[PDB]
Design a protein around this ligand. Sequence first.
Ligand SMILES: NNC(=O)c1ccccc1Cl
Lengths: 237, 300
Amino acid sequence: GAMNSSNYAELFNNDIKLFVDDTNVYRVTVHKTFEGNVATKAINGCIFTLNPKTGHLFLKIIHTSVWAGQKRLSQLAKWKTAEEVSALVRSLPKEEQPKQIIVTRKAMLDPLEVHMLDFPNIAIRPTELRLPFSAAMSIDKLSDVVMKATEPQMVLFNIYDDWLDRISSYTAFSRLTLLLRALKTNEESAKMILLSDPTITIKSYHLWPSFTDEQWITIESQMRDLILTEYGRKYNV
Amino acid sequence: MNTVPFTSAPIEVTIGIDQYSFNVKENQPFHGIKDIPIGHVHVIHFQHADNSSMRYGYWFDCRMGNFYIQYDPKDGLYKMMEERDGAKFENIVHNFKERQMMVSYPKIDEDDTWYNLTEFVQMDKIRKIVRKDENQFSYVDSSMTTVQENELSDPAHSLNYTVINFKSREAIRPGHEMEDFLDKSYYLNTVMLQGIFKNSSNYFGELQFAFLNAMFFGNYGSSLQWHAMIELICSSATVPKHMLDKLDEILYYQIKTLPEQYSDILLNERVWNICLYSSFQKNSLHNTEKIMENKYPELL
Ligand SMILES: NNC(=O)c1ccccc1Cl
C-alpha cells in the first residue's frame, strides 16, 4: 500500500522504483493588473522523478507554452505529469522500467494509474513521508536549466553526484533529504551553509560542493542545527 | 391474472411477492398466491423463520409457463418448478381457489409502484444475467457473487452483470486519459450504450434488476452494480435528455420504495452526494434529489 517509516529500507533494495514529485510542475507569479484585479503569470516548471537507489533524476522541464489556452491548470498539471511519467516509462527498455512508482502527493494517484493502465504490473503508490522534493528548485544547477528552457525538454541528472562511491544509497538519500529539508525551511541560511568556504567548490560536472567525509559531517550537523533552530523561531521554543 | 400454487408450507417462512410480504406458519394450510398481474416480471422470495440467513427467491414471468412452489426437505428450501401438463395445473389451481387456500396479490388500483420499478426489466435479459438455461425462471440469493467480484468463485452460481470499471482500458481511450476519466460520456454512450447494451432500455433494465436484487436479497454485488450504473450516467457530461428524465423517474421510485431502516447499508454516501451535488448531472435529477433530501437528509 502506502510508503512510510516502517518500510523505509525498501527504497534501497534492488527492485527499480521511482519517486514522482509534481509540486513544481505548475508555477505562477501572482500580480496586480492595471484595473487593480489580480492575474497570474506562469513560469517554467519541472517534474521531479528520482530513482532513490541510483540517484538518477529525470528532470522533465515544463515550458509555459503547455498551459496556453488551457483551463483548470492545477488539475491539468497532475494529468500532464502523469502523461510525461508514462511517456518516460515507455521510452525505457523493459529491464529498466520501474516496478513501483511512488507519488509524493495523493492527488497524483488517479492521474498516474489511468495513464499507466497499459502497465498493470507497475505498482502506483502513495507515501506518508513528508519529503522535501519541492525544494529541488533551490538547487542552482536545476533552477537554471528550468528557467532557461525555451521548449519542452528532459535533462537526466544524478542528484547524488559521486557520493555513492563512498556511501550507501540509504545514507546518500538521508543526506539529500536533510539538505533539501534545510533549503525548504530557510533557503538563505541553508545556501550560506553550503557555500561559505570559498575553498570548497562545485565541480562543473556536479550539482552540490566537493566536501570531504569530515566536512560532510560538519555540514550535515549544521543543517540539523538550522532545522531545529527555525523550528524554534517558528514555534518559539 | 395468474397463479403460483404451493404444494405445501412445511416450514415457517416469510414469503415475499414483489414488494409485498406475509408470514406463513409451520404446516399452515397455505397453497399459494393468486391474481398476479400479467404483463410484468415478478419475484417470489423467502426468508425462513429459523435461519434469517439466506434470503432467496425466483424471478419469473407467468406468460412463460405454469410455475409452482414445492418445499424440498433434502436441500431445505422452497423451490420453483414448472408444470408441463397444463390440464393438471388448471385443475390443481381451481381446486385450491375453490377451497380459498390462496392469498391474493394485493395490488391497489392507483398503484403503479411495481410497474415503475420493473418498467425496463425483461425475463429474457434476467436469464442472461442469471445463467441456468433449463429453467424459465431464475434463482437469486443473498450470497451470490457477480462476475466482477470473482475477478477481484463458482462461475455457475454467479450474477453476470455487465462489468463497469472506470479505471480500465475499456473505459479510457489512449490519448484521452484525462478527458475520458473526468467526463465518462465516451464510455457511457459509445462503449456501453451503442456497443454493449444497444439501447437505453436494456441499460435501465440491468440497473433496475440490480437494485431489486440488492433490496430484496441484500445482495451486495447487485448494490455495487446499481451504484456503478448510476454513477456512469451522472459522470457523463453528454447524456440524451430522454435518458436523464427517465433516470430521474426510475431512481425516484427506487428511493421511494427502499425500506427506511435499510438505507445505511444499501445507499452509498459517496456515490449519492457526488451524483446529486458534484456531477455533470447534479441539476438534472429533480424528483430524485427532492425525495432523497426529504427522506435521507442524513446521508447528505
Ligand atoms: N551535474 N550534472 C550531471 O548530469 C552529472 C553527471 C554525472 C554525475 C553527476 C552529475 Cl551532477
